[PDB]
């Protein structure tokens, strides 16, 4: 919640998991060359999913920061 | 008048200032204008 | 004569106060709009960022999410300004008329923008 | 790498100026507040 | 009217604080992810190695 | 005379003064002579 | 830690203003009382 | 940017003087009121 | 309150009911305003009688 | 009691806080015995001064 | 893009290929 009325809230969507769902980073077991190369294909995709998650956070506290400068000016002039 | 101080508006501005200040100092420490934080996530990515 | 004067005077003191509350109303509205402008400043910032090195920022997708978030802000700020439970500027505000003296229809019509979210 | 710096490498020779400005504001608005909070004090001390 | 204003104001101060704690939450999450990325950077380093 | 005090005219002037005072302080905080408020909306725009 | 301060760390640059207001009120209501307690004194001193 | 400041950037080295003037007026008119509200008091205290 | 969905609806409760209160307080507004006049008035009657 | 939306587990304490205040709205509701026939709780009979 | 207005851009024409087209 960021105001005074009901259901006035910012839903946030933290990534459900990090360990075994970044297929898995833990799945790979590099030791064979053919798995080294495919490993890179794994990490690349999943890393993109991470930095999408980090960028989701980008939108969320940017959203917060404005919201509170704004809210703060409201409670001011009220 | 005494019931309150409209000049607390000054305070608000300073809060923003200090926020900017801290972030600048972070950028000045590491030399990274894009903090490791999300901020400007495009260039970060 | 004095009864008419006291009529005028204390009536106009109340009308002064009604005007002062109106000043505050328009002030809060102004603050909300200032911050709408900070967002829109950011929206040009993001639209220009969204050149993407013309196609090189694949992660425009993240920017799209960023945009969506800011778009949602222009709904939240559009709501949440309930000076009266009859809030300022979103949806439908009915162009109200602040009295500033003691006589009938002696009022200042004000024309708050009917909406902010989906009509900018 | 040179690109990576053009992305990240703050031109802090400018951000120093921005920095001073922020420090400056902290100082100034503060002194303004040290003045501002004297107002109501005066108001009542005199009307009494 | 004022009772409604005080309602609004102090309610929104609390909501401001709830938001600030949220800012901190997302900040800590961000730090954790930064360092996940340092690892994954190392994972490509090791896959190429 | 007691029924009222014409010197409340003094009060009125001070109200104006305090208004100016507060606005000046705002301008001195942020360094913006045009407040984020509407005032002098041309230069603001 | 930064969160811990956002919870605890008073923005006393505001609470200073609140502080003055309280000190101010102590002073003012007091002087009002120094005036108020003179009322009954006058009432009787005159009706007698 | 330089234009943006010529628009916004208060020449507060002048507005400081304006500021003092306003603070000054608050003080002065106040003291005038502390004097003014003594007038009717005197009027009746004497005619009685 | 303890559940969030009850927090939000809780606000909807308190708002309405608080309006009923301050209506009650305003009922009192009319009543001693009514009294105050009534007794200045009555008092002037018993005077001139 | 948004709780950082789920982050204040100790809403439980808030619930207790709420309960206490709820009990106040009974105590103030009682305890106003101007006459042994107190003001506003339960049933007051709409009297006529 | 190199300014703030729409379609204010520098088209670039990288060679479509290097391997089999030189």
Author numbering:
A (entry chain K): 148 to 169, 385 to 440
B (entry chain g), F (entry chain W): 5 to 49
C (entry chain A): 50 to 169
D (entry chain g), G (entry chain U), H (entry chain W): 441 to 488
E (entry chain K): 50 to 98
I (entry chain L): 392 to 440
J (entry chain L): 99 to 147
K (entry chain W): 148 to 169
Give sentences copied directly from the paper behind this entry:
Next, we analyzed flagellar filaments from the Gram-negative bacterium Pseudomonas aeruginosa to compare with a Gram-negative species. Since the D0 and D1 domains of P. aeruginosa and S. enterica share a high degree of sequence identity (55%), we tested the conserved L- and R-type mutations characterized in S. enterica (G426A and A449V, respectively), which correspond to G420A and A443V in P. aeruginosa, respectively. We found that these mutations also generate straightened filaments in this organism. Filaments from these two FliC mutants of P. aeruginosa were sheared off the bacteria, concentrated, plunge-frozen and cryo-EM imaged. Each mutation results in L- and R-type straight filaments as expected, which suggests that the D0/D1 architecture is indeed conserved between P. aeruginosa and S. enterica. For both the L- and R-type P. aeruginosa filaments, we identified three pseudo layer-lines in the power spectra from the filaments, besides the 1-, 5-, 6- and 11-start layer-lines that are similar to B. subtilis, which correspond to non-helical perturbations. We obtained near-atomic resolution reconstructions for the D0 and D1 domains for both mutants: at 4.2 Å resolution for L-type filament G420A and at 4.3 Å resolution for R-type filament A443V based on FSC of the cryo-EM density map with the resulting filament model. That we could reach such a resolution for D0 and D1 confirms that the perturbation is entirely limited to the outer D2/D3 domains, as previously suggested from lower resolution studies of other bacteria. The three L-type subunits of B. subtilis and one L-type subunit of P. aeruginosa aligned very well in both D0 and D1 domains. From our structures, in P. aeruginosa the D3 domain extends along the 11-start and forms a dimer with the D2 domain of another subunit; while in S. enterica, the D3 domain extends from the filament and does not interact with other subunits.
